[PDB]
Amino acid sequence: SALVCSLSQECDLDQSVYAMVFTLLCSLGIVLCLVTSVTVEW
């Protein structure tokens, strides 16, 4: 897309710079990694 109440999610909406969604996906991945390691060790 970059290769040229308001916003929406989960579709090709041609939104502006979407770094927030990428940031949230990164954060979820990191948290999941932590919980996975802890559960396996426990």
CA dihedral 28, 30, 33, 41 (to 10 degrees): -120
- CA distances in angstroms from 42 to 11, 28, 36, 37, 39, listed in the order given: 39, 21, 10, 9, 5
Cα(30)–Cα(24) distance, rounded to whole angstroms?
10
| Structure obtained using | cryo-EM
Contact status, residue 32 vs residue 26, Cβ threshold 8 Å: no
